[PDB]
Amino acid sequence: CKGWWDHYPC
Amino acid sequence: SIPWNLERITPPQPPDGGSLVEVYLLDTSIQSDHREIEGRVMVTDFENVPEEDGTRFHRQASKCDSHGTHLAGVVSGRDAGVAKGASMRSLRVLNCQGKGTVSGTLIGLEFIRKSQLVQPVGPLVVLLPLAGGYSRVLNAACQRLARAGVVLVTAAGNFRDDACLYSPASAPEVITVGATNAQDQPVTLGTLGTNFGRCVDLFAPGEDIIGASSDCSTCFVSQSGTSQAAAHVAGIAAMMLSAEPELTLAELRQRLIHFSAKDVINEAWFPEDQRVLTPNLVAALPP
Amino acid sequence: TATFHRCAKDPWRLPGTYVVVLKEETHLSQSERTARRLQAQAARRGYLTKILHVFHGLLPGFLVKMSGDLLELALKLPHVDYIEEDSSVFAQ
């Protein structure tokens, strides 16, 4: 996973 | 690390999977220049949507594109997609509030068949991440497109109810997909959650799914729903059809069941009489 | 034998627009003629109609904006299989 990111989290 | 859902569909990362298949998406508008899907999604000229509710509605692209952009990413996204080689074509049948009509969806399904007849390519997969009440005409149009050789995948519906009361979920020829979470249990969505019953073919990851966010060209956000689950199955079907392009619809359905993880869902979540009717299958890629 | 159908979820119905579905092998020329015949019969009763789309390729038929008062008349048109009132679909 839950969330929001300004780039690919993984 | 990898998103939980992509690990879940991997038997216990193909870089160009599904390249022989074209996936049509009937949904909201999409942010076609988002880095996750740029070049992989072709925006058709098709648009048939109802007016938004409320006379002071503000049509902001980032909000209008949210649903469709995320689902295009789940299917073919560069970083977080299932079938990274699959081409997509988008049709707009849902407005900025995610609402459409049966008639607009019918005209969209006809546009897909017309496009195919004019310029045929490889096997086609049609993703319908939407639902309305039981519709004789929508089920009929879906049955005719499936009989014409096109593979259709739809969301089971997010009403914690029998999928047979909704369309296109209730069409037998369409692959109908319910949603499961990281614990392989049926997804809860507010006071409702995934649909179930004999009209559901299988389940797939549908909670906290990382995918393209239309807030910015490199942004990602987690979303939940049977739309996300159906997008996983459209991706897996694109991969299976690209590996074995001569598969008929019946054979593809057999492959999806065969490679699914079995008996991992706790049937106690479903109402008592629906436990024997709901297939205990969670989709997965072949090894 | 032609029947009328409308959404069981009453708040999801979209009255005033109907999908007229013709029999399986009905040709596009026959669909267009049937739509024009409906507009003419409706006009004789004082009603306006608008043909929004003529279907061909999967299901023959047409999408018409008209008063539901004309449904008894429309179900008697040549080649009609069934008529369905339009209804909403939602992102899942």
Coordinates of N, CA and C in Angstrom, one line a residue, chain B residues 136, chain C residues 1-5 19-24 26 30-31 34-35 37-38 41 60-62 66 70-84:
Chain B
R136 N -29.1 -8.6 -20.8 CA -29.2 -9.5 -21.9 C -28.4 -9.1 -23.1
Chain C
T1 N -43.4 -12.6 -30.0 CA -42.3 -13.3 -29.3 C -41.1 -12.3 -28.9
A2 N -41.2 -11.0 -29.5 CA -40.2 -10.0 -29.1 C -40.5 -9.5 -27.7
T3 N -39.5 -9.4 -26.8 CA -39.6 -9.0 -25.4 C -38.9 -7.7 -25.1
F4 N -39.3 -7.0 -24.0 CA -38.7 -5.8 -23.5 C -38.0 -6.1 -22.2
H5 N -36.8 -5.5 -22.0 CA -36.0 -5.8 -20.8 C -35.5 -4.5 -20.2
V19 N -31.9 0.0 -26.8 CA -31.2 -0.8 -27.8 C -32.1 -1.8 -28.4
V20 N -32.4 -1.6 -29.7 CA -33.3 -2.5 -30.4 C -32.5 -3.6 -31.1
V21 N -32.6 -4.8 -30.6 CA -31.8 -5.9 -31.1 C -32.6 -6.7 -32.1
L22 N -32.0 -6.9 -33.3 CA -32.7 -7.7 -34.3 C -32.2 -9.1 -34.4
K23 N -32.9 -10.0 -35.1 CA -32.6 -11.4 -35.2 C -31.2 -11.6 -35.8
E24 N -30.5 -12.6 -35.3 CA -29.1 -12.9 -35.6 C -28.5 -12.6 -37.0
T26 N -29.9 -10.7 -39.4 CA -30.4 -9.5 -40.0 C -29.3 -8.7 -40.6
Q30 N -31.3 -4.1 -43.8 CA -32.6 -4.4 -43.1 C -32.7 -3.6 -41.8
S31 N -31.5 -3.6 -41.0 CA -31.5 -2.8 -39.8 C -31.8 -1.3 -40.0
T34 N -35.5 -0.9 -40.9 CA -36.4 -1.0 -39.7 C -36.3 0.2 -38.8
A35 N -35.1 0.8 -38.7 CA -35.0 2.0 -37.9 C -35.8 3.2 -38.6
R37 N -38.4 2.8 -40.5 CA -39.8 2.4 -40.3 C -40.3 2.8 -38.9
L38 N -39.5 2.6 -37.9 CA -39.8 3.0 -36.5 C -40.0 4.5 -36.5
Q41 N -43.4 5.3 -38.2 CA -44.6 4.9 -37.4 C -44.7 5.8 -36.1
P60 N -26.9 -7.2 -34.8 CA -27.6 -6.3 -35.7 C -28.7 -5.5 -34.9
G61 N -28.9 -4.3 -35.2 CA -29.9 -3.5 -34.5 C -29.6 -2.0 -34.5
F62 N -30.1 -1.3 -33.5 CA -29.9 0.2 -33.5 C -30.2 0.7 -32.1
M66 N -36.0 7.8 -27.7 CA -37.4 7.9 -27.9 C -38.2 7.7 -26.6
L70 N -43.5 4.3 -27.0 CA -43.5 3.6 -28.3 C -43.0 2.1 -28.3
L71 N -42.7 1.6 -27.1 CA -42.2 0.2 -27.0 C -43.1 -0.9 -27.5
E72 N -44.5 -0.8 -27.3 CA -45.4 -1.8 -27.8 C -45.3 -1.8 -29.3
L73 N -45.3 -0.6 -29.9 CA -45.2 -0.4 -31.4 C -43.8 -1.0 -31.9
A74 N -42.7 -0.6 -31.2 CA -41.4 -1.0 -31.6 C -41.2 -2.6 -31.6
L75 N -41.8 -3.2 -30.6 CA -41.7 -4.7 -30.5 C -42.4 -5.5 -31.7
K76 N -43.3 -4.8 -32.4 CA -44.0 -5.4 -33.5 C -43.2 -5.2 -34.9
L77 N -42.1 -4.4 -34.9 CA -41.4 -4.2 -36.1 C -40.8 -5.4 -36.7
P78 N -40.6 -5.5 -38.0 CA -40.0 -6.7 -38.6 C -38.6 -6.9 -38.1
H79 N -38.2 -8.2 -37.9 CA -36.9 -8.7 -37.5 C -36.6 -8.4 -36.0
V80 N -37.5 -7.8 -35.2 CA -37.1 -7.5 -33.8 C -37.0 -8.8 -33.0
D81 N -35.9 -8.9 -32.2 CA -35.6 -10.1 -31.3 C -36.0 -9.6 -29.9
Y82 N -35.5 -8.5 -29.5 CA -35.8 -7.9 -28.1 C -35.3 -6.5 -28.0
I83 N -35.8 -5.7 -27.0 CA -35.4 -4.4 -26.8 C -35.0 -4.2 -25.4
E84 N -33.9 -3.5 -25.2 CA -33.4 -3.3 -23.8 C -33.2 -1.8 -23.5

